[PDB]
Coordinates of C-alpha atoms and ligand atoms in Angstrom, one line a residue:
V1 CA -30.9 8.5 12.5
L2 CA -29.5 8.2 9.0
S3 CA -31.6 7.5 5.9
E4 CA -31.1 4.3 3.8
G5 CA -29.8 6.7 1.1
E6 CA -27.1 8.0 3.5
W7 CA -26.1 4.5 4.6
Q8 CA -25.7 3.5 0.9
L9 CA -23.2 6.4 0.3
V10 CA -21.3 5.3 3.4
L11 CA -21.1 1.6 2.5
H12 CA -20.3 2.4 -1.2
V13 CA -17.1 4.1 -0.3
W14 CA -16.3 1.6 2.4
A15 CA -16.4 -1.1 -0.2
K16 CA -13.5 0.6 -1.8
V17 CA -11.6 0.9 1.5
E18 CA -12.0 -2.9 1.9
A19 CA -9.9 -3.5 -1.2
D20 CA -6.9 -2.5 0.8
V21 CA -7.6 -2.5 4.5
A22 CA -4.0 -2.5 5.7
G23 CA -3.0 0.4 3.4
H24 CA -5.9 2.5 4.5
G25 CA -5.2 1.7 8.1
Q26 CA -1.6 3.0 7.9
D27 CA -2.6 6.2 6.1
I28 CA -5.2 7.0 8.7
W29 CA -3.1 6.3 11.8
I30 CA -0.1 8.1 10.5
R31 CA -2.3 11.1 9.6
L32 CA -3.6 11.1 13.2
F33 CA -0.1 10.8 14.8
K34 CA 1.3 13.6 12.6
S35 CA -1.6 16.0 13.1
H36 CA -2.1 15.3 16.8
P37 CA 1.2 14.0 18.2
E38 CA -0.4 13.8 21.7
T39 CA -2.4 10.7 20.6
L40 CA 0.8 8.7 20.2
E41 CA 1.2 9.0 24.0
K42 CA -1.6 6.5 24.5
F43 CA 0.4 3.7 22.9
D44 CA 3.3 2.4 25.0
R45 CA 4.0 0.2 22.0
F46 CA 4.3 3.1 19.4
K47 CA 5.4 6.0 21.6
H48 CA 9.0 5.4 20.4
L49 CA 8.3 6.0 16.7
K50 CA 10.0 9.3 15.9
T51 CA 9.4 9.8 12.1
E52 CA 6.8 9.0 9.5
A53 CA 9.4 6.6 7.9
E54 CA 9.6 4.6 11.1
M55 CA 5.8 4.6 11.3
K56 CA 5.4 3.3 7.8
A57 CA 7.9 0.5 8.5
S58 CA 6.2 -0.7 11.7
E59 CA 4.6 -4.1 11.3
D60 CA 2.8 -3.7 14.6
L61 CA 1.2 -0.4 13.6
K62 CA 0.0 -1.9 10.3
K63 CA -1.6 -4.8 12.3
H64 CA -3.3 -2.3 14.7
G65 CA -4.7 -0.4 11.7
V66 CA -6.3 -3.5 10.3
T67 CA -7.8 -4.4 13.7
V68 CA -9.3 -0.9 14.1
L69 CA -10.7 -0.6 10.6
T70 CA -12.2 -4.1 10.7
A71 CA -14.0 -3.2 13.9
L72 CA -15.3 0.1 12.5
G73 CA -16.4 -1.7 9.3
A74 CA -18.5 -4.2 11.3
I75 CA -20.2 -1.3 13.1
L76 CA -21.0 0.7 9.9
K77 CA -22.4 -2.5 8.3
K78 CA -25.0 -2.7 11.1
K79 CA -26.5 0.6 9.8
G80 CA -27.2 2.0 13.3
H81 CA -28.1 -1.3 15.0
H82 CA -24.6 -1.5 16.7
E83 CA -25.5 -1.8 20.4
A84 CA -23.8 -5.2 20.8
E85 CA -20.7 -4.2 18.9
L86 CA -20.2 -1.0 20.9
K87 CA -20.4 -2.4 24.4
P88 CA -17.0 -4.2 24.5
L89 CA -15.4 -1.4 22.6
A90 CA -16.7 1.2 25.0
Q91 CA -15.5 -0.8 28.0
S92 CA -12.0 -1.3 26.9
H93 CA -11.5 2.3 25.7
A94 CA -13.0 3.9 28.8
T95 CA -11.5 1.6 31.4
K96 CA -8.3 0.3 30.0
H97 CA -7.0 2.6 27.3
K98 CA -8.7 5.8 28.6
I99 CA -9.4 7.4 25.2
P100 CA -11.2 10.8 25.5
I101 CA -14.0 11.6 23.0
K102 CA -11.8 14.4 21.7
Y103 CA -9.4 11.8 20.3
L104 CA -12.3 10.0 18.6
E105 CA -13.1 13.3 17.0
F106 CA -9.5 13.6 15.8
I107 CA -9.5 10.1 14.2
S108 CA -12.8 10.9 12.5
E109 CA -11.1 13.9 10.9
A110 CA -8.2 11.6 9.7
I111 CA -10.6 9.1 8.2
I112 CA -12.5 11.7 6.2
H113 CA -9.2 13.3 5.0
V114 CA -7.8 9.9 3.8
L115 CA -11.1 8.9 2.0
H116 CA -11.2 12.3 0.3
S117 CA -7.6 11.9 -0.9
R118 CA -7.9 8.3 -2.1
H119 CA -11.5 8.2 -3.3
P120 CA -12.5 11.6 -4.8
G121 CA -14.9 10.0 -7.3
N122 CA -16.8 8.2 -4.5
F123 CA -16.4 10.9 -1.8
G124 CA -18.2 14.0 -3.1
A125 CA -19.9 16.5 -0.8
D126 CA -23.0 14.3 -0.2
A127 CA -21.0 11.2 0.5
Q128 CA -18.7 13.1 2.9
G129 CA -21.8 14.4 4.7
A130 CA -23.2 10.9 5.1
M131 CA -19.8 9.6 6.4
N132 CA -19.6 12.5 8.9
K133 CA -23.1 11.7 10.1
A134 CA -22.3 8.0 10.5
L135 CA -19.1 8.9 12.5
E136 CA -21.0 11.4 14.7
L137 CA -23.6 8.8 15.5
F138 CA -20.8 6.4 16.5
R139 CA -19.2 9.1 18.7
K140 CA -22.5 10.0 20.3
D141 CA -23.4 6.4 21.2
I142 CA -19.9 5.7 22.6
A143 CA -20.1 8.9 24.6
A144 CA -23.4 7.7 26.1
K145 CA -21.8 4.3 27.0
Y146 CA -18.8 6.1 28.5
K147 CA -21.1 7.9 30.9
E148 CA -22.8 4.6 31.9
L149 CA -19.5 3.0 32.6
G150 CA -18.2 5.8 34.8
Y151 CA -15.8 7.6 32.4
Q152 CA -16.3 11.3 31.6
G153 CA -14.5 11.0 28.3
Ligands
LIG201 C1 -12.4 4.5 14.8 C2 -12.3 4.4 16.2 C3 -11.7 3.3 16.8 C4 -12.0 2.0 16.8 C5 -13.2 1.3 16.1 C6 -11.0 1.3 17.6 C7 -10.9 -0.1 17.8 C8 -9.9 -0.8 18.6 C9 -9.9 -2.2 18.7 C10 -10.8 -3.3 18.1 C11 -8.8 -2.5 19.5 C12 -8.4 -3.9 20.1 C13 -9.4 -4.4 21.1 C14 -9.6 -3.5 22.3 O1 -8.6 -3.3 23.0 O2 -10.7 -3.0 22.5 C15 -8.3 -1.2 19.9 C16 -7.2 -1.1 20.8 C17 -6.7 0.1 21.2 N1 -7.2 1.4 20.8 FE1 -8.9 1.8 19.7 N2 -10.2 2.2 18.3 C18 -10.5 3.4 17.8 C19 -9.9 4.6 18.1 C20 -8.9 4.8 19.0 C21 -8.2 6.0 19.2 C22 -8.6 7.4 18.7 C23 -7.1 5.8 20.1 C24 -6.1 6.6 20.6 C25 -5.8 8.0 20.2 C26 -7.2 4.3 20.4 C27 -6.3 3.7 21.2 C28 -6.3 2.3 21.4 C29 -5.3 1.6 22.2 C30 -4.2 2.3 23.0 C31 -5.5 0.3 22.0 C32 -4.5 -0.8 22.5 C33 -3.3 -1.0 21.6 C34 -2.4 -2.1 22.1 O3 -1.9 -1.9 23.2 O4 -2.2 -3.1 21.4 N3 -8.3 3.7 19.7 N4 -9.0 -0.2 19.4

């Protein structure tokens, strides 16, 4: 459970991300694909992208980034009361896409890295700790749902 103070640090930096959702989306996914090339294998629609240049020029990847960050933002804004939002997300990722928890750990790393690079003034040590906590909570709850749905993760 996060304190109100920790949620405030998370939503404060998220407000900055929302000024440019598409841009943040691209940076985060490209970071993920570059650092962990294996994750690209999960997208039959992006598995053909060979360079960062092709990734940055992909309209479909940009759209995916917006879809993902909008869903994550909705969850964070619930401040822990995200049961309803997580159910459909857990079902599609465990049953259809088959995304292991390890990959959610990788994207969490990418998110923290991008926020640190683009928002140093609003992402000091305390704020990073709060964001890490919020993302760990998200991963812990999705993991619990994965189990209930029959997917090891
Ligand atoms: C911050 C965590 C993430 C959030 C909130 C998120 C959210 C979403 C949403 C809302 C969709 C569209 C609806 C759906 O199919 O459920 C989606 C699709 C998908 N996600 Fe996730 N996702 C996350 C992380 C990941 C990761 C780490 C991977 C893979 C390494 C992944 C792979 C996919 C795939 C393969 C699709 C379908 C893409 C397509 O065929 O159009 N997701 N995700």
